[model samples]
Structures are given as C-alpha cells and as structure tokens.
Target: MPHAFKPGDLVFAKMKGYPHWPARIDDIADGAVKPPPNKYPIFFFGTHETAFLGPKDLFPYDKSKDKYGKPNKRKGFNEGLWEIQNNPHASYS
Candidate 1:
C-alpha cells in the first residue's frame, strides 16, 4: 500500500524535462468520495503547473547539505522558483 500523506508534508516528485529540479508536496487533495479505488493524494509545488497523483515514480531526497559540498536539497516543483526568490535582493528591484 502507498503511504498516506497530509498537508505540509515535505514530499518529492520526479518531473520530466527538468532532472535537477525537486518538487515539494505543499498540499494534498483527496477525491470527493472515500473508499473509492481511484481516490489519491495530490502533491503541490510552486513550479509545477499542476499537482501530481500518488507517490509512485518518485524518490525522496535529502534537504541537508553533505560534507563533500553536495546539495541535500530535495527535488521539488518549486525549486526553480525558490532559487529566484533566494537570489540577491538587488536582482528583484
């Protein structure tokens, strides 16, 4: 059985076109009905145009940096957008 997730859970998803990008699961949307075979969770990330269904085809990455200068940040849909937000303040104004 797939793991059940809740809102604000830091989940990861694999996206096509962008291999280095990580996706964060910001929200979950269960179908209107319960005990349904098709009911699944929707993972949300700022970069993704939309949410993803189920945890399949996804792997969880670390968020902490490694000692060898390796990034521990998990791949998420909003990583690109987050980089923009974290860039120098001067670039925005």
Candidate 2:
C-alpha cells in the first residue's frame, strides 16, 4: 500500500488564517523561501487561491538584470510577475 488517511488526517499545513493560502508541492527546489507548511487544518480544501512556483521562477531585486524580468522572458507575460520570476539575470548592468 502507498499510504492511507485516517478519519482525522495528519495532513500537511499552510497559512490558513489571514491569507487563506495554500502551497505548492515540488520535487526539487532551487531557491524560494518556501518554508514547509506546518500549520495543519483538520479540514483541508483541495481547491484554493494559491500560486504554484519554482525556485528558478524567482530572483531578488538586486539580482534582476532587467527592470522587467519574465515579462521580457515571455512576451505574453507582459505586465509584471516577471522579474525575480527567474534567476534575476542582469540585462542592464
């Protein structure tokens, strides 16, 4: 058997109060401050307002080469959510 859940699951966790947030499950990580979700809710919602991200999907501001990042990486992603969305390579300097 793989694994089983009981009536009360010892489920995974998240910031379930203020942000009404859930998290993404990844195999390997690059570098995102994704502290493992440790706040369990007895009842979990499978569908919630959450964004799935990867480490290569981010970069610190100082590290970002272009003021606009992924927006430039992908023409369609042409608003924001682009920068730190990558390794924040330097295109300007």
Candidate 3:
C-alpha cells in the first residue's frame, strides 16, 4: 500500500532529469485544471503547465534542500515554487 496525500498536505517532488528542481503540492482540485474534466482532478501550484498530477513514486522528498527563504523576483520559476497534482493516469507524452 501507498500513502495517499490529501488537501493541504506538505509534499516535495522532483523531476527525474532535474534533480535540483522541486515543486510543492498546493491544492487538489475535483477535475483537470483545463476547461474540460478528464480522468482525474489536478494539483495546482503557483501556475498550471508547470506541474500536474503525478504518481506517488514520481515525487521524492529531499530534506537538505528545504530552507526557509524569502521569495525573489529574479529567481522566478527557477526557485522551484510550484504545485503538484495526483493524476497517475495522465501522460506527459
């Protein structure tokens, strides 16, 4: 069995190729962020397209990278401040 995350859960996820990159789990919606409803709802971050609902295994936690820092405009999206959804059926391809 796997741990199921609910709304308001603090989570950390990183892309496979981009280890330095990380995103946060903001909110879990009822359906896709897009106009129409899909197989599952979407996890919204600061913005869509940046992150989507993914599998539990896809998200990994890295404690060393966690730090309390202020947001910088220059850092922008590179800061890794984004949200993630839990849509295992969705495909990036």
Q: What does each candidate score in C-alpha RMSD?
A: 8.5, 15.9, 9.1
- Indicate the TM-score of model 3: 0.34
Clashing pairs in 3: 43-85, 45-83, 53-85, 53-87
lDDT string, candidate 1, 1-93, tens digits: 545654444434444644433334443335532322432333333444434445563444343112111243445434443532343112211
Better of 2 and 3 by TM-score: 3
- lDDT of each structure? 0.38, 0.28, 0.38
- What are the clash counts of all predictions, listed in order? 7, 7, 4
Candidate 2: list runs displaced more than 4 Å. 1-57, 67-76, 81-93
What TM-score would candidate 2 get against the native?
0.21
What does the lDDT come to for candidate 2?
0.28
Give the better candidate number (1 or 2) by TM-score.
Answer: 1
Output the lDDT of residue 91, model 1: 20
What's each prediction's TM-score?
0.38, 0.21, 0.34
Ordered from best to worst TM-score, the candidate numbers read 1, 3, 2
